[PDB]
Ligand binder design. Sequence first.
Ligand SMILES: COc1cc(-c2cncc(-c3ccc(C4CCN(C)CC4)cc3)c2C)cc(OC)c1OC
Ligand SMILES: COc1cc(-c2cncc(-c3ccc(C4CCN(C)CC4)cc3)c2C)cc(OC)c1OC
Ligand SMILES: COc1cc(-c2cncc(-c3ccc(C4CCN(C)CC4)cc3)c2C)cc(OC)c1OC
Ligand SMILES: COc1cc(-c2cncc(-c3ccc(C4CCN(C)CC4)cc3)c2C)cc(OC)c1OC
Lengths: 284, 292
Amino acid sequence: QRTVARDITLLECVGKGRYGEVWRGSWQGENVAVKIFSSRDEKSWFRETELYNTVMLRHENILGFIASDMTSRHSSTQLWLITHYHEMGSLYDYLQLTTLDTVSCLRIVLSIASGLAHLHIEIFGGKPAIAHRDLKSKNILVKKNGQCCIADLGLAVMHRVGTKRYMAPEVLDETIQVDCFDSYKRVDIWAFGLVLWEVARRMVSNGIVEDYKPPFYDVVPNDPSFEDMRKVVCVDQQRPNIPNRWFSDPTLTSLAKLMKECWYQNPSARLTALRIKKTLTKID
Amino acid sequence: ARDITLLECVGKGRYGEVWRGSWQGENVAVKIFSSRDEKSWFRETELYNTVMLRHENILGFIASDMTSRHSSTQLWLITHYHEMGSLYDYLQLTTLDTVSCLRIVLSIASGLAHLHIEIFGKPAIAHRDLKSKNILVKKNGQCCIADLGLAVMHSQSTNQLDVGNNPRVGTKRYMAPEVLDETIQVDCFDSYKRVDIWAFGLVLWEVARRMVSNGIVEDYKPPFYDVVPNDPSFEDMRKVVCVDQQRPNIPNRWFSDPTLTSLAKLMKECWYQNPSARLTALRIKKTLTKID
Ligand SMILES: COc1cc(-c2cncc(-c3ccc(C4CCN(C)CC4)cc3)c2C)cc(OC)c1OC
Ligand SMILES: COc1cc(-c2cncc(-c3ccc(C4CCN(C)CC4)cc3)c2C)cc(OC)c1OC
Ligand SMILES: COc1cc(-c2cncc(-c3ccc(C4CCN(C)CC4)cc3)c2C)cc(OC)c1OC
Ligand SMILES: COc1cc(-c2cncc(-c3ccc(C4CCN(C)CC4)cc3)c2C)cc(OC)c1OC
């Protein structure tokens, strides 16, 4: 009746971690990304698969799903997640080989806000509300049209822990109301504010730019402990530095105010993804 | 090599379709789920992730896939192919001698005991939709159990029970009294094993009817064929099993044969209304190992 060409040629490894590996692959002449999970992180494959089995998310700012594959091996299970391939790589990688003008800085952050507001919002008829729970520049891909898309729904919740560098105060101090879905949206908004800070630093104004640095680069070690982060974020209540040079630029002044309204200690005071999108459409 | 050719449809219901396919020259079974049963696909995928699930009397897993473009999703389970089909099919076209009757029912008991018993690995597994259509016949004369889409997992070792998330219920005709009257204790793993033992008793009865003794054999019939309408509803089955307290009739010719006399005793100890009085899968396997 019909042939099912399932052969994906794995061409080069574009990512490796504890989690497993991502490969650039070829299916029918067409690039795909293949995430091969470690046995240690099987739960992230199951959670992303269960989510996509519940709702087939389709959004220009969400990494495009192609397939979940489980293949039986002699004495193990092989778990692959297959998605759209973005040759420009992660925002993390990208911010380290370019600076940004005002148009490209706004296009990036508005696209991430659009992807996040799409996750957060319940649609009837539709989709459940979704919180990401591991938003960071490494989990955002850059597209050729200058918009981004959000990747990695292995920790997502519908209505492993977060990267410690990006954890909100209520996660570090264990006061998060874990039976309140809104609590998880507020944790993503905190993380969003740090990504906004990472991008805004690489936007040029009056001939000046900051070097790419991760959030809290100046106050915590590489691979910060849970304790290291709690002391900075909860006990001392430190926030990322806004450089003086931003206050000469109308875009970076508005973006400083935005990222501040993502970092309130009180989660319920933080802006929503929808309110961030509205603010970004009125900037410039 | 991952490339699969779909050669013919061997089955089709509201569940979806099964196809005979070719994959590396070998026959494979490809099940394509309806979107209405997406929760069974995911649950079956969870169950086949258990590497110690593999057993001669459990349908062998090859791959599971969810594939999507735009708003369209396909859900695939790929297994080993059994060209003799299901026990339900086979029992309609053949009678059985003693040796073949015991080999079939011992092999089903052996698969079920494998599911039910924790390995310290593999959780304890209750199937919850055991029936002759979910049992495939192999060329060595043994059977394997298929369809883990309703299965419940338990570990005594970590005190965890995973009932999963599937609104699907068992085939009505094979439902235990406590399933039909909805008094089944949902947070008790032992409850789900006891539901499997009930259904197993019905499968034993379907098989034993086809074993010849003294030149006599019954026609193939499904459980409760004589007491409910065609395509019985949940309420139809609750009436006969719960209100009327019916159980399958033991043909009197069985009492002339030592094997069928022993099997009649066995299946009746699967059918107590008190779930805790029913035999365990391991006891059934040990009893069938000693019967000849
Ligand atoms: C199983 O596995 C993989 C499969 C595929 C794949 C390859 N060709 C064709 C398909 C296909 C899509 C959709 C239909 C429709 C047509 C009829 N309609 C009424 C219902 C169903 C049929 C066939 C698929 C799904 C790709 C893979 O990798 C990219 C697979 O492995 C992950
Ligand atoms: C965050 O996580 C996931 C990411 C991806 C993913 C998707 N497109 C492209 C990429 C990528 C490609 C290429 C480079 C490099 C290599 C070539 N050059 C030297 C610079 C650029 C970096 C990154 C990735 C990593 C897929 C995933 O799943 C299948 C992910 O997990 C959910
Ligand atoms: C998973 O991913 C990809 C899949 C495919 C692909 C291959 N065969 C068949 C199909 C297909 C055909 C028809 C229907 C529908 C048509 C409307 N209605 C009647 C229900 C059935 C669905 C699916 C597809 C989508 C191609 C891709 O790209 C070229 C894919 O992306 C990598
Ligand atoms: C129950 O469940 C699953 C079963 C199978 C499966 C495996 N081998 C062989 C079969 C088969 C072949 C052929 C016939 C014949 C019999 C009668 N004749 C008039 C028409 C057709 C019947 C059955 C099947 C149906 C695969 C599955 O998944 C891939 C199943 O789901 C878990």
